[PDB]
Structure formats: structure tokens, C-alpha cells
């Protein structure tokens, strides 16, 4: 009947926190080169077996749009690019007037044989060289004709060292002691809210940081039904994030057997120009089985009417705005940067009641200003030989149209301008909390009296 407060140390209490998180990668050390952009020299090796620990009776809220982990990975990825770009060859001298001509007379020409003076090793001597340039990287200025690189009026440019690789490898994330990562095990997880089935982990799953646009690649998938996650579905301004239940297959090729020209532009500095194409000159593309794509859209309009009425007209259209990098399924494949016309996909109309694979034309750039970033642009060096990379589509990014004639019908086109939106596709299942091991409760236990 005598109540006394009593102290307990190591009690299961935690609080939501924004803290400094850490990297995690398999301790595979395949250096046997000098590559590796993401894992770097010493990202901490992963646990052999993760101790994903289920928590009985525990119900926790997740919100992927107000998540601090997304807004961290995004900045985490950014610093690595600059850190990998700094020691490389800066192409300040490639802004000379370029004299370019068309390649092909058997027209059935998007690429230029470009001659220009350059700097040699000796400061006084100059050189006339030729390189091949894709049309997007270059612009005409005023008889010859005379041209320049697209970047020279926006920003300086630096060339990625050839040694570095652009391949996303799965990267986990581990929390320091006193913190914890909470992981939602709900299959039907709404965009936001409380997840009834919760496990705790020291590190997240292997998140492949595939930077891509309009479509998520080599990601993590969704169980049961395809998942529609928005911050607000009914709000057009907030995007609509989609996670697939079945992965589809994509084969991407740059079908010309290109060649690399090492041009010395100073002591140590060396520019990697695009040499003569060998074999046919073919345009890059990607196929996706048309059959599989009709299947995948059905699961979508099915999860859609659960949020739009059993009957309404749901059609798909192509992108209608943005930069060239947002109008296209932009991605990187093997080290060349692809930008693909997606109109054959988002062309159908759905009434909600062989392979014959669709081919997508793709343009290619070597000058890139990624992350909607103005300032340091990059020269992706030409990749010697033909390119072919296989990527799954593990998701989508869509967006609805504004106010029409009473919503008669609803229309969906892609695009993902923020990049975090790609990270949310792999981070919806995680949340950060800080550990509070101190609990106070009233008991009849009293300490022995001092007197």
C-alpha cells in the first residue's frame, strides 16, 4: 500500500529519430581491378545471417513519404558521384569550335564526325582531331558548319575515369547501437500508416541503387496484388508510386560496335573520344514481351479501381513534358546513358470491364547532368564494343491528369523527377527509431533505509 517508484534499465521503449545511418554491402571483395563506385574501399561487411527479429504484439506506423531514410539515401548517392568525379580528367578544353559533318549517305544520321583543334602535350602545339558525337551532346552555332557541345554554355564538364564502374550493387544500411531500423512485413501495405506485422533488423535489404526514370529496375517486388502507394492518390501533384507483383524482362542493347580513341590533351590528362563505328551503325533499343506487358497492366487497373470506382475509363498515355531526361525511360546500361521513347507502352485504353515483343528506340548521351542538377556535368566515356544489359522492371512512377469533364475517364503517364521517388520504391518497408532503455513504474519495492 506503500507505492514507490522503481528504475528499470534495458526496457523495450524506442522513439522516432532522424540519425546518421551507415552503409552495408556483402563482403565480397572482387577488386581484381580498380572499380567499384558504390561499395567503395570500406563499406562495412554484411552479417552472414541477418537477425531479422519478429516483435510480438507490436504495431508500428510507417510513412515512406515523410521518411527520413529516403531523403538520406538520395544525398548519400550524390556525394559518391562527386567523390568519384573529382580526380578524373576535366574537359575544359573540349569546348573548342567543333567542325562536324553527318556520317551516313545511305539514309534510312544522328551522329557526327567531328573535327576540331585541341591542345597537345606541349602548351604551344595544337592538334586537329576527330571524334564521333551523338546529336544530343552538340549544337550548331551560326557555312561549314560550326558546332559546340551542349554543356559549354551551362557548366564545366568532367570525364568519369574509365576505371570506375556505374553498376548498382545491392547496398544495405545498418544502424549504430542505441538506434534500430524497423521493418514492415505487411504485403498489402498501404502507402502510409501502421504496419501490423513488424520485425526489427540491424541492416536493410540489398537495395540496388538503380538510377532510372519512368521505370524502376532491379528493385524489390510486391507480394499478392500490385501495390499503389502515393502520399495522396487523389492528388495529382503527389506522384503515384507503383510496385509490381510480377517482374517483366527487358533486353537493352546499343547495337554498334563502337571504338575508344585515347587523345592526349596534356600531361596525364587524356580524352577518350568516340572512334569510327565498326560494322553496321544501328540505334539502341529495348524489347519487352508485348504479351507480358498486357498481363502486367491488368493487375494495375485492378488495384486501381480499388481506389477509383468499379467502373470508370482508365487509359494510358505517354509522357507530355519535362526535360529529355524525364520524357524518356532514362537509365544507364553498361556505362552508356540511354534515353528511350516509351509510347508503344502507354498507348492503350482499358475499360475495366508468341511474344510479339515491342521495341523501343533509344537515344544515347555521353554528356549528362543527372539529379536535376545544374553545375558539374559529366562526360561518360565511350564504351568499346556493343552494349547489352538485362534489367527487370521492379516498379513504375506514374502521374494523373487534372480536372476534366466530371472524371468520366482517368489517365496515367509516367515520370519521376525527384530521385528519392526511386529510393522510396526500396525504402517503404523501413523506418528509423532511437532506443530509450530507461523505464519508470510504481512498485511496492523500496530500497533499504539509510537510517
Amino acid at each position, epitope marked *: 500500500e506503500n507505492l514507490w517508484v522503481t528504475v528499470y534499465y534495458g526496457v523495450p521503449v524506442w522513439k522516432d529519430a532522424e540519425t546518421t545511418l551507415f552503409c552495408a554491402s556483402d563482403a565480397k571483395a572482387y577488386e581484381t581491378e580498380k572499380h567499384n563506385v558504390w561499395a567503395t574501399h570500406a563499406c562495412v561487411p554484411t552479417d552472414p545471417n541477418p537477425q531479422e527479429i519478429h516483435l510480438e504484439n507490436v504495431t508500428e506506423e510507417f510513412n515512406m513519404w515523410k521518411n527520413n531514410m529516403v531523403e538520406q539515401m538520395h544525398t548519400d548517392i550524390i556525394s559518391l558521384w562527386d567523390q568519384s568525379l573529382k580526380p578524373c580528367v576535366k574537359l575544359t578544353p573540349l569546348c573548342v569550335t567543333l567542325q562536324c559533318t553527318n556520317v551516313t549517305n545511305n539514309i534510312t544520321g544522328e551522329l557526327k564526325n567531328c573535327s576540331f583543334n585541341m591542345t597537345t602535350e606541349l602548351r604551344d602545339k595544337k592538334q586537329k582531331v576527330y571524334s564521333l558525337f551523338y546529336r544530343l551532346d552538340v549544337v550548331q552555332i551560326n557555312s561549314n558548319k560550326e558546332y559546340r557541345l551542349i554543356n559549354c554554355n551551362t557548366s564545366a564538364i568532367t570525364q568519369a575515369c574509365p576505371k570506375v564502374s556505374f553498376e548498382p550493387i545491392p547496398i544495405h544500411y545498418c544502424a549504430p547501437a542505441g538506434f534500430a531500423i524497423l521493418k514492415c512485413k505487411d504485403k498489402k501495405f498501404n502507402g502510409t500508416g501502421p504496419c501490423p506485422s513488424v520485425s526489427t533488423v540491424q541492416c536493410t535489404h540489398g537495395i540496388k541503387p538503380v538510377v532510372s526514370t519512368q521505370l524502376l529496375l532491379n528493385g524489390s517486388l510486391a507480394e499478392e496484388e500490385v501495390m499503389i502507394r502515393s*502520399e495522396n492518390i487523389t492528388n495529382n*501533384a503527389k506522384n503515384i508510386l507503383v510496385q509490381f507483383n510480377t517482374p517483366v524482362q527487358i533486353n537493352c542493347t546499343r547495337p554498334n560496335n563502337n571504338t575508344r580513341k585515347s587523345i592526349r590533351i596534356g600531361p596525364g590528362q587524356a580524352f577518350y573520344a568516340t572512334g569510327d563505328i565498326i560494322g553496321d551503325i544501328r540505334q539502341a533499343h529495348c524489347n519487352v514481351s508485348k504479351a507480358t506487358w498486357n498481363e502486367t497492366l491488368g493487375k494495375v487497373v485492378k488495384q486501381l479501381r480499388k481506389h477509383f470506382g468499379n467502373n470508370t475509363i482508365i487509359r494510358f498515355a505517354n*509522357s507530355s513534358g519535362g526535360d529529355l531526361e524525364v520524357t524518356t525511360h532514362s537509365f544507364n546500361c553498361g556505362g552508356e546513358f540511354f534515353y528511350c521513347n516509351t509510347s508503344g507502352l502507354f498507348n492503350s485504353t482499358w475499360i475495366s470491364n508468341s511474344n510479339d515483343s515491342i521495341t523501343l528506340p533509344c537515344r544515347i548521351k555521353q554528356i549528362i547532368n543527372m539529379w536535376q542538377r545544374i553545375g558539374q556535368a559529366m562526360y561518360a566515356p565511350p564504351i568499346q564494343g556493343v552494349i547489352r544489359c538485362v534489367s527487370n522492371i521492379t516498379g513504375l512512377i506514374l502521374t494523373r491528369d*487534372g480536372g476534366s469533364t466530371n472524371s468520366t475517364t482517368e489517365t496515367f503517364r509516367p515520370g519521376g523527377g525527384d530521385m528519392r521517388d526511386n529510393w522510396r520504391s526500396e525504402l517503404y518497408k523501413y523506418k528509423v527509431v532511437k532506443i530509450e532503455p530507461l523505464g519508470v513504474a510504481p512498485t511496492r519495492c523500496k530500497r533499504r533505509v539509510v537510517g
Partner: antibody, heavy 123, light 98 residues
């Protein structure tokens, strides 16, 4: 600070195009969307579009797709819009705006408003 | 279909009763003075935007919003409007009989 200013009023005739600027200042233009609304002197306002500078992307009220084109110039913190196939039926007051100083990240609604550009279409 | 009253009688020192019915209605409430520059009065339905007068507040329903004013003035003689995301209600010319 935190304000919208639009190009000068115009009068154009049927078929013709029209481009209107909306110079923005006092906030970091890039982060927030930008919608455009049309008031006729004598009917409601008819939303048209939005365009984040970060990606430059859009979507237009189906009453309006195709005829319209919205453009930005982040070098200068400014947006634009161009309306083609002008008919007399589209003469109205055109205001640019955005939500910035709210505490509603849901993009809606709009509080910060250009004075407007009046466009008369009539032969 | 987004709708609201068209005209409302009023007078100084009084209170005015207006409506708006529609799905997700009463997202914000505006005031256009004859001429230019419409202006947001209350975001959401009951959110005094930081930087307006306090005698402003709003109520709503599952589909019907309602904006409320005390101590009317001739300064509030203008057209008043109901925002619904993409869609904008018809338009009430509030008259303050002075």
C-alpha cells in the same frame, strides 16, 4: 520577396499563338510546382496545369491538353506558357501561382499569386 | 460537380452564411476584388493561414463545406470562391449593404 509577376497583357486573334511569362522571385523557385489558372470575366476559374522546375514535367486539364505548352527558365527563375489555336472563346484573365508559405506539402491549394495577364482574343 | 451559393445578403457588424458542396471540397477559400489578384483566406477548411485575421474560420462535412465570417465590413465586399483541388466552385458575390 515571395512573389509572382507576369508578362504584359496582350490581344491576339483566332488561330494565333500566345506566350506568357511569369517571373518568380523571393523563394527558391526550383522546389515547388507551378500551376496556371484562367478566369474569364464571368465564369469560374479553370485550372490548366502545373510544372515542377526540378523536372520540368506537367499535366493539363483535359479541356486544355494539346493547345497548351508550359516552359521554364530556371537560369532566371521564370516559367512560361504558350497557348496555340487561339479562339475568341479563350479570352480571359490568366494568373500564375504556387503554394510555398503554407505548412501543406500536399502541393495544394495556392496562396502566392501573380497579378495576372489579360488576353483578349477577338477578330 | 462543384457548387456553392451565388449571392448572399449582408451588412456591417453582421455574419454571413455561405456553403459549398462537393467531394474533397473546402480545400481553401479565396477573395477576388474587382480586378486582379485572388487571395487565399483559409487553407484546408479550418486553417487560419499564418498571416490573416482571426475572425475567419470554416466548417464542412463529408461533402459540404461552409465558410463563416463575423464582424462584416465593406472591406469584404468581393467575390468568394470554393477550392477543390483541381476544381473551383462557381462563385458567390458577397454584398455588404452600406
Amino acid at each position: 520577396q515571395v512573389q509572382l509577376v507576369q508578362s504584359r497583357a496582350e490581344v491576339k486573334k483566332p488561330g494565333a499563338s500566345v506566350k506568357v511569362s511569369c517571373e518568380a522571385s523571393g523563394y527558391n523557385f526550383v522546389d515547388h510546382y507551378i500551376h496556371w489558372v484562367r478566369q474569364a470575366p464571368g465564369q469560374r476559374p479553370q485550372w490548366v496545369g502545373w510544372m515542377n522546375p526540378r523536372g520540368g514535367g506537367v499535366n493539363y486539364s483535359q479541356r486544355f491538353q494539346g493547345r497548351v505548352t508550359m516552359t521554364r527558365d530556371t537560369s532566371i527563375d521564370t516559367a512560361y506558357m504558350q497557348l496555340n489555336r487561339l479562339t475568341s472563346g479563350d479570352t480571359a484573365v490568366y494568373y500564375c501561382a504556387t503554394q510555398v508559405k503554407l505548412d501543406s506539402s500536399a502541393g495544394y491549394p495556392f496562396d502566392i499569386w501573380g497579378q495576372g495577364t489579360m488576353v483578349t482574343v477577338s477578330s | 460537380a462543384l457548387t456553392q451559393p451565388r449571392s448572399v445578403s449582408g451588412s456591417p457588424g453582421q455574419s454571413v452564411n455561405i456553403s459549398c458542396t462537393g467531394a474533397y471540397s473546402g480545400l481553401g477559400w479565396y477573395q477576388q476584388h474587382p480586378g486582379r489578384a485572388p487571395k487565399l483566406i483559409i487553407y484546408e477548411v479550418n486553417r487560419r493561414p499564418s498571416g490573416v485575421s482571426d475572425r475567419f474560420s470554416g466548417s464542412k462535412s463529408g461533402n459540404t463545406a461552409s465558410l463563416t465570417i463575423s464582424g462584416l465590413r465593406t472591406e469584404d465586399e468581393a467575390d468568394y470562391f470554393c477550392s477543390a483541388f483541381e476544381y473551383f466552385g462557381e462563385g458567390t458575390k458577397l454584398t455588404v449593404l452600406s
